[PDB]
Assembly symmetry: D2
Homo-oligomer: 338 residues x 4
């Protein structure tokens, strides 16, 4: 039956996930609690009024201890430390980890000590003992008992992995390389300020800033055949949302642009319905705000050099599209709860 | 004497201050130490490379706990707790407090408890007990013994006060209002994220964002005759540096556009040289990047409606100009030192 | 009965007007033709996909000579010269002038020679013989026979005029002054390039650029009692949409903040329903995208100095809100057609 | 000889060219006239004040039909039709064509018909019959008599060619792909507005915008061995200056990251001094503002996947660096002049 759910850290991903879930047709989820480093006041307001999502059209209320949306009432808490959270008493089955701060098996597992059964990191996990899934790529390989702490990977990996999969299943990937042109995030600085990354230290809205990305390697986690076959880098540009992957692969079967486009389109219609969108129209970044899929292939941008060096460009709503997938993963965890 | 100076917090203001100070002709200041949350490497890199100021043209080098600029070595410490600092042992006369977090008389006097004799908050003072000075406005009221904790006020006030002084001295301000169209700062949030000001909580580079400002009440600290006579609001817009003040005052002696521009000009050549720049060219914000002055009167924007309702638009480089003034205020304390 | 309508110049205003009209509950208008300096291809695509409005959710088709939206078929033409347009044969009653280029009584009147009965400039008119209306302020004063060429003023004047009216009717305006902080427009340059205005010549997205505005004077056109009582200036900032008016007036009846807020709210509920919105929530510029009203008063920003110097700040969607008014004016022209 | 030069079109490239030329050590060029759509006033103002370059530090003065810089007077004309120009009577050897509209052999030869002996398009050549040179790449193939109309190619090609040359000379390029993340330019539209490229039709400072580029085919004009071996796409992002090229080539001799960085470095010290800058610091885009070089290799971004799939990231100041190269190309034509 249904599983009870709480959110941890009500930021971009956290509020996106909610609105994604509130838009859902059907569900096996019951959101019931939210924990964030701010009062309920600042919660129910960043929810309704979003610089990027536009205004959430829904009945929204709040008091000191709760917030409420379209009938449904949640519960608000405020513990910087998950070990202190009322998950046992509140019979919390799954916690969505969206603080960005508890991404190790241990930290994410503090929610387990506190009474929760399973935790879903909305971000790559670090260290050992987290199970990583990307919907459309990996999720047939899901067993409730494998991991109490799971990861939905990164927004970038979710864009990249489904395209890698299709390209691989159809032409065989030998090796390749990838660049992501990414809208800045909160991990960057609006002005030159201290950061562990001497580049992310620098004013985000007036720079192209190069940075590292684990995403090309991460595909290995969900497509182990591509282990050591992909590298990459990211470039932060001053957009606030939507991002793009530029993937170049040496492929085993010689092909043409029309054909790799054909197979990507096929997938968008079939094995990848809902995950890959196929765009043949001459569009730009803002046109994909609020798109549900995880990779949006720009077919007119696909390229093939001498039969076997292919390039495809895929867009993604790095916040919203990713949040539809974390929803999906949660629904899957629900349906498969052993 | 020649006084020994420590910089607490090596951010925008902190680094501008060092850059301004190295480019000075003569000085009664010796900068001996710097405390900042990062390491000496991160500090020297952020010092040499600046997105707004461009490259620092100097000989810069660093080891594990010092940076050296043009022969002058300065010790680096990393201590979030000002009570810990070895100011007594390093014979520190003046601490420049530019962390933005010790802005009360008590917070900032942590530096005095640790051995310093005077501290200069590079921001307005919070609460009672700090002494505030705006070079060109009330610096003649500076007395060594008055306060252990002193303030250079805000960039906005430093832009407002000089213009207000000249306007009031020549026509008599009765009451007035001001709006500041301000580049975003590090106190503003990168993307939609929590903040005590729900408006400051929103993505700074995609929003015009209204916030309160103390700047207009503050001018009374330095021009007491204006007490109770000015209020203002601020609107944060997506540029990374240089702001503008839009001042509307009702005035005692009726006047004309030609005449107020005339007095503002006269001032810029005499009583306010170096403090008020007088610009009669059709310029825009970026042209004032690097301007040493505090206020830059845009002369062709001056309006006088029906004799006694005057509007003056004045730009300011909100980091660089302001930082030249903190230098000035530090030099001043040095010369009046007892 | 209904009047037949054509649009001239399918840019921001032109496409906004259409979508506004397509969202309308009821109507006395029948759009039937569109004339723009580009094929129908580029027309039906800039319509559906908008960087600012988001995607137009509606059934949209096009061939070489037409475009079609939700059943309704229009007709596409392409004459840089209105004298060549098929208005006579197409029995065109009203033309919406949105090219920005035919804003004199003569030029706008070329549409008359070509067979149209009335023309509505979506912009201030210049020279003599255009009748200017701002809904909520002036429109009771509308007579079909006064002008064959009418003007809906500017987006800025529409924000300013209703607030001036209410403030005047309640407290008596003596004189005042206004600044608009405006999202850049197509009349600006993305980079430093030649322009009749030496300031609008300069890179719009990385400058605060001062420019002139006729808006404060224009209020005189629709509130002749305020003739010579208002001046102002504009400041272009790098946002793409939403703008703000900052209005400061010396008022005759001494009042308080609560009260001027009270009267503005009253108006938003009554004589100004649909034109003035009253916002008491702590919001930012992006939150008013797609708002229908012409002035959005930010009550928490209202100020009163010594009883009789009042400041109110009003937001506006400079494209969308203005386009709801041009629709309104057109509906009025229809209903009053003598 | 020492040659007489006219500048047709005083825009970004036009003005950079003059600024670059005045800051040159020695010159075989004499600039005698300038043709631009505006007046002499607008030209001198745009020359002194530049949003990207900041203030031109020179003695600048102007009358109705001349500007004077550091003693050197240059005549101003305003003639949209190159056939009209008095190049024969002013004994004009070399016309710098930087209007962006006479880019075919025939369009540009209008200047030859009007009396000039050679024209240099500051952009790629459209169609057959123009000669193309990239300083540092094939300038040794420059022969006075080969073409009346010559080209400096695009900023992107000027960044790509040098890197391509060194990569190919040392490892042997087989085939490859490139993407250019480019600051927006004046060919890009301010807000959503009509254009032949529906993607270039969209607001440049709020969109990542994909457009085609000839840059990768073009490198073959200057490195013929690369004919048919490179393709590319461009992505326009919201910065006003400095771009970056992301180059992926499959290579004949297997190699390692250390070694390609080694050869790129060696080059930057020897065979490509002044053309390729070698940056091993963790920098960002703004740090390359004002860089004289053509390509700036970001050494820590270099990737080599599995021996023969190399990626190099290289920045360029797309206006300033490129304009130093048009100077170079003009000096070159001057020295080889017959
Ligand atoms: N932004 C994207 O596009 C994107 C895409 C994929 C994954 N992610 C990942 O999602 C995670 C969240 O990133 P974000 O972009 O939403 O930034 P965010 O600022 O929105 O972080 C979300 C929230 O966590 C809250 N929080 C912090 N510490 C907390 C604590 N101790 N207890 C409870 N709440 C706490 C913060 O106050 C914030 O509201 C990150 O790990 C990021 O890597 C982000
Ligand atoms: N930016 C402007 O235009 C402007 C103008 C005038 C005044 N100010 C004032 O300058 C002050 C600094 O603002 P900023 O713009 O320079 O932001 P900032 O970049 O300087 O951030 C402040 C610095 O202090 C450091 N720091 C934080 N906590 C510390 C601690 N406990 N101990 C030691 N160091 C610590 C931070 O790591 C950073 O280096 C603020 O109070 C602001 O109001 C700013
Ligand atoms: N942008 C605003 O916020 C705003 C607000 C109020 C009023 N206005 C006014 O609206 C008018 C249009 O401005 P805009 O912002 O929509 O710019 P715009 O670029 O969208 O101009 C609209 C269209 O007119 C077309 N056009 C040009 N010449 C033509 C011709 N000879 N025949 C037919 N079509 C032609 C252009 O191709 C463009 O598509 C201007 O006069 C402006 O002052 C604009
Ligand atoms: N911006 C870059 O990074 C870059 C780099 C390399 C090459 N280019 C090339 O430089 C050329 C100019 O582009 P830009 O960026 O300098 O835009 P721009 O600012 O220079 O606009 C071009 C100039 O030419 C003038 N002009 C237009 N028509 C004219 C005519 N008929 N006669 C005389 N003058 C006329 C315009 O008024 C303006 O002064 C383009 O062809 C572009 O492809 C640009």
């Amino acid at each position: 039956m249904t599983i009870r759910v709480a959110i941890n850290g009500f930021g971009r991903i956290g509020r996106n996930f909610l609105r994604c879930w509130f838009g859902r047709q059907n569900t096996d989820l019951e959101v019931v609690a939210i924990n964030n480093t701010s009062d309920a006041r600042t919660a129910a307001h960043l929810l309704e009024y979003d610089s990027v999502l536009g205004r959430f059209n829904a009945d929204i209320s709040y008091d000191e201890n709760s917030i409420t949306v379209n009938g449904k009432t949640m519960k608000i808490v405020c513990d910087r430390n998950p070990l202190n959270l009322p998950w046992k008493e509140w019979d919390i089955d799954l916690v969505i980890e969206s603080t960005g701060v508890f991404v190790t098996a241990e930290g994410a597992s503090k929610h387990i000590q506190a009474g929760a059964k399973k935790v879903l990191i909305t971000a790559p996990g670090k260290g050992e003992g987290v199970g990583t899934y990307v919907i459309g790529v990996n999720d047939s390989e899901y067993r409730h008992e494998d991991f109490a702490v799971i990861s939905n990977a990164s927004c970038t990996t979710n864009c990249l992995a489904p395209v890698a999969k299709v390209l691989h299943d159809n032409f065989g990937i030998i090796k390749g390389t990838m660049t992501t042109t990414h809208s800045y995030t909160l991990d960057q600085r609006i002005l030159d300020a201290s950061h562990r990354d001497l580049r992310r230290a620098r004013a985000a809205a007036v720079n192209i800033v190069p940075t590292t990305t684990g995403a090309a390697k991460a595909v290995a986690l969900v497509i182990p055949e591509l282990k050591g076959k992909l590298n990459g880098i990211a470039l932060r540009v001053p957009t606030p949302n939507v991002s793009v992957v530029d993937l170049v692969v040496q492929v085993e079967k010689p092909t043409i642009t029309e054909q790799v486009n054909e197979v990507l389109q096929k997938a968008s219609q079939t094995t990848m319905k809902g995950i890959i969108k196929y765009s043949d129209l001459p569009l730009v970044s803002s046109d994909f705000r609020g798109t549900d899929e995880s990779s949006i292939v720009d077919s007119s941008l696909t390229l093939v050099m001498d039969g076997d060096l292919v390039k495809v460009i895929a867009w993604y709503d790095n916040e919203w599209g990713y949040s539809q997938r974390v929803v999906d993963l949660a629904e899957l965890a629900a349906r498969k709860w052993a």
